[PDB]
């Protein structure tokens, strides 16, 4: 059931490293992005997938110091304790090329790219949940962008949009409420 | 298989009205939105679901004339021929309230709302594909926004983002290529 798969995806903050088949996890991350739609099949999403030492480095050597410096002008341990982090970027070189090819609709491509980032982020999140792995989505962009690009030698054109922290589920999702259907769905014949 | 469900979703332009259980279709549309994540559980997505006479009216009485007037300053028959159209909006009143509650991060909420629209659009699209129904995603916003709001008495705060045309599959999806994995995925340990 696709709907059941959607329901199974939740924000899990308590994450560990009890992950049995990392190769299968990577395969599924790639597939979830591969089969996601993007405007004009532009495929603007880019991923940096960090585990092990690189996972430790992101949180200890980049996020923590950047955040401290930012604040001046715990939760991090929880993120570090996870198995890995998937950093989602949108390739601005491709967006700019589309804007150049289709000037009358230049305003659309950044919007559709942003939508595209949401799309691939949740498809990956849901795919991970199907494997029994939890995840949560963070936003320490744009603070960490430069340091991340330098450390992993990323193209300047990759614009960081989100960081999906993932791993084994160590405690259940919290409670979550839903709006009244009547306030968000209108059906007319 | 969640990945298989993703692969099964495609852009289908040749759509008909050979839909067996409209109530089940509506149920699934609602569920796909219900179980989609949004920042702060803000649930900013709003849907207008049109079938039958309302489907005819949208394309014949709103999109066609607006587009003509716009151009001055076929494909439409293909959209009209579908069973229905799901118009996706984002509730700007909720976005503004979040911006007010969290002023330091006011810039984030419009971005996350845009991502949210992508998220619910593709979750609905994929859910429909699981039922064997095809769909395609159009963007005649902002040209049709005012006329749509007036005809179906929608709140001013609903900002139209996309229109998912759906129905029975009358011809297969076209060919689609994929980028080289090496150009969009980096894995580091
Ligand atoms: C676009 C987007 C941005 C989000 N931003 C964050 C964030 O920065 N930090 C965080 O902890 N959760 C974040 N969330 C998680 C949402 O708060 C969560 O998805 C929502 O409360 C629904 O709960 P669920 O994921 O368990 O279904 C984000 C979700 C989405 C879709
Ligand atoms: C954010 C977004 C906007 C899109 N805009 C349009 C559009 O306005 N008109 C259209 O015919 N297709 C549109 N598409 C469809 C894409 O071109 C299509 O998803 C892509 O070529 C991949 O093909 P597939 O949907 O068969 O997998 C859009 C897709 C996405 C995700
Ligand atoms: O072709 C364009 N717009 C047409 C006009 O109706 C249409 O809206 C459209 C938009 C996106 C698209 N896509 O993502 O493949 C296809 C057609 C421009 Cl965005 Cl270049
Ligand atoms: O709380 C905020 N930011 C924190 C700071 O780290 C964090 O980025 C966050 C963002 C979104 C979120 N959500 O969508 O529920 C939760 C925490 C503001 Cl956006 Cl109000």
List keywords for this structure.
homodimer, 189 residues, alpha+beta, NADH Oxidase, 7 helices, 21% strand, globular, binds flavin mononucleotide, binds chloramphenicol, oxidoreductase, dimeric, copper induced nitroreductase D
Question: What's the SSE blueprint?
Answer:
The structure is a homodimer of 189-residue chains.
Chain A: H1 2-8, E1 15-16, H2 22-34, E2 45-51, H3 52-72, H4 75-80, E3 84-91, H5 92-101, H6 108-130, E4 133-138, H7 145-151, E5 158-169, E6 185-188
PDB class: oxidoreductase
Keywords: oxidoreductase
Assembly: dimeric
Task: Explain what you see.
2 copies of one chain form a homodimer. The first copy, chain A, is an alpha+beta fold and 189 residues long. Chain A has a single domain (1-189), classed as NADH Oxidase (3-Layer(aba) Sandwich). Helices cover 46% and strands 21% of the residues of chain A. The first copy, chain A, has 7 helices and 6 strands; from the N terminus they run αβαβααβααβαββ. In chain A, strands 1, 2, 3, 4 and 5 form a 5-stranded antiparallel β-sheet that branches. The radius of gyration of chain A is 18 Å and the shape is globular. The relative contact order of chain A is 0.22. The interface between A and B is large, with 62 and 62 residues. Strand 6 of chain A pairs parallel with strand 2 of chain B, so a sheet runs across the interface. Residues 39-40, 102, 105, 108 of chain B line the site of one chloramphenicol. One chloramphenicol binds at residues 39-40, 102, 105, 108 of chain B. Chains A, B: This is Nitroreductase domain-containing protein. Chains A, B: InterPro entries: Frm2/Hbn1 (IPR033877), Nitroreductase (IPR029479), Nitroreductase-like (IPR000415). Chains A, B: Keywords: Cytoplasm, Flavoprotein, FMN, Nucleotide-binding, Oxidoreductase. Chains A, B: One of its GO terms (biological process) is cellular response to oxidative stress.
């Amino acid at each position: 059931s696709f709907i059941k798969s959607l329901e199974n995806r939740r924000t899990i903050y308590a994450l560990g490293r009890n992950v049995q088949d990392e190769e299968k996890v990577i395969e599924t991350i790639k597939e979830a992005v591969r089969f996601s739609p993007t405007a004009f099949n532009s495929q603007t999403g880019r991923l940096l997938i960090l585990t092990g030492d690189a996972q430790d480095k992101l949180w200890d050597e980049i996020v923590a110091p950047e955040l401290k410096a930012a604040m001046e002008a715990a939760k991090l341990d929880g993120f570090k304790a996870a198995f890995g982090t998937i950093l989602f970027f949108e390739d601005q070189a491709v967006v700019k090329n589309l804007q150049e090819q289709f000037a009358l609709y230049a305003d659309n491509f950044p919007v559709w790219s942003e939508q595209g980032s949401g799309i691939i982020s949740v498809n990956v999140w849901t795919a991970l949940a199907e494997l029994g792995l939890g995840a949560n989505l963070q936003h320490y962009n744009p603070l960490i962008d430069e340091a991340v690009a330098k450390e992993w030698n990323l193209p300047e054109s990759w614009k960081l949009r989100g960081q999906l922290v993932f791993g084994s589920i160590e405690a259940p999702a919290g409670e979550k409420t839903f709006m009244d259907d009547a306030d968000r769905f209108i059906v007319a014949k």
